[PDB]
Write a protein that binds this ligand. Structure first.
Ligand SMILES: CC[C@H](C)n1nc(N2CC(C(C)(C)O)C2)c2cnc(Nc3ccnc(-c4cnn(S(=O)(=O)C5CC5)c4)n3)cc21
Length: 300
């Protein structure tokens, strides 16, 4: 059959989690900001703690734990461990800049072409990795891309990942519930559109029930003002009826990489290049002592 999944599920003690405060709540559940202080290791890891006491809630979150514990890529979010309390909690890496959707909306005036094109390469890299691991995300959107640093993004939310977000879904998925890596490619094109429009809602005001009809007639999301025909043509290719005619994620990495070498040729932004976003070599970016990021804290 398939290859044995030898990933390790780390059961973490409640007593090892300090300075807990709410980051956000919604349909997704509740995400808390915390500090993981393991054993006598002299490390304080900034963490995010997710929870959806119901047996069906524990089933769904343990399915997300299963997928999230099985992934290992710089552009994908890995599970650090789980905490078994009244409800099952997922322990993950704190992404200080939150989701990419809210980031593009709040920092629109300082987001340049190089940042936008790099985010596209990075999302495609993480997506290609999921394809290698034979995983179909089934919920790629700008809301599910987290910002570690303005120059480093990662894909998350494995609640729907396998081996309804209508406005992000490929037409085969809306009509026949068919999900493939090529259906994820359609969602990637919508994710790209969301970025290029600085967080615009796709098909705003249009009800979900009308989307399938809109797509069948031949209607697609419009060309963002900053997008050259070069960038939009890539988005359009992700939205073709025939899934096999859509680009492969490895081709999106190549296409956006070439473009990111001359970003002003592919994205037209007023007051470009001069736009600055916080870097790790800048003041007040970071007890403070013994703080180690999850990407630098390997195994026990
Ligand atoms: C995505 C929204 C979630 C509430 N959230 N908010 C953050 N903070 C906002 C705060 C400021 C204001 C300072 O910007 C940063 C934040 C930081 N790290 C992680 N960490 C991770 C890591 C891996 N996965 C997840 C994860 C998985 N599912 N979800 S979700 O269901 O909340 C997603 C659909 C929104 C988050 N979170 C998640 C974070």
């Amino acid at each position: 059959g398939e290859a044995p999944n030898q990933a390790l599920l780390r059961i973490l003690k409640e007593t090892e989690f300090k300075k807990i405060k709410v980051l956000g709540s919604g349909a997704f559940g509740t995400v808390y900001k915390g500090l993981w202080i393991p054993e006598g290791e002299k490390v304080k890891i900034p963490v995010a703690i997710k929870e959806l006491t119901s047996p069906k809630a524990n089933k769904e979150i343990l399915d997300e734990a299963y997928v999230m514990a099985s992934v290992d890529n710089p552009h994908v979010c890995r599970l650090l461990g789980i905490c078994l309390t009244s409800t099952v909690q997922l322990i993950m890496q704190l992404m200080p800049f939150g989701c990419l959707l809210d980031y593009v909306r709040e920092h629109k005036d300082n987001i340049g072409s190089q940042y936008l094109l790099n985010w596209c390469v990075q999302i495609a890299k993480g997506m290609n990795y999921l394809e290698d691991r034979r995983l179909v995300h089934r919920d790629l959107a700008a809301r599910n891309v987290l910002v570690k640093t303005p120059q480093h993004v990662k894909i998350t939310d494995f609640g729907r990942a396998k081996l309804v977000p209508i406005k992000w879904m490929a037409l085969e998925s809306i009509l026949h519930r068919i999900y493939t890596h090529q259906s994820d490619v359609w969602s990637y094109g919508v994710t790209v559109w969301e970025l290029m429009t600085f967080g615009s809602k796709p098909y705003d005001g249009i009800p979900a029930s009308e989307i399938s009809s809109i797509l069948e007639k031949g209607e697609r999301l419009p060309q963002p003002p900053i997008c050259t025909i070069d960038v939009y043509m890539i988005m359009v290719k992700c939205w073709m009826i025939d899934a096999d005619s859509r680009p492969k994620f490895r081709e999106l990495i190549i296409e956006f990489s070439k473009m990111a070498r001359d970003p002003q040729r592919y994205l037209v932004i007023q007051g470009d290049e001069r736009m600055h976003l916080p870097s790790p070599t800048d003041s007040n970016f970071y007890d403070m002592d013994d703080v180690v990021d999850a990407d630098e804290y390997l195994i026990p």
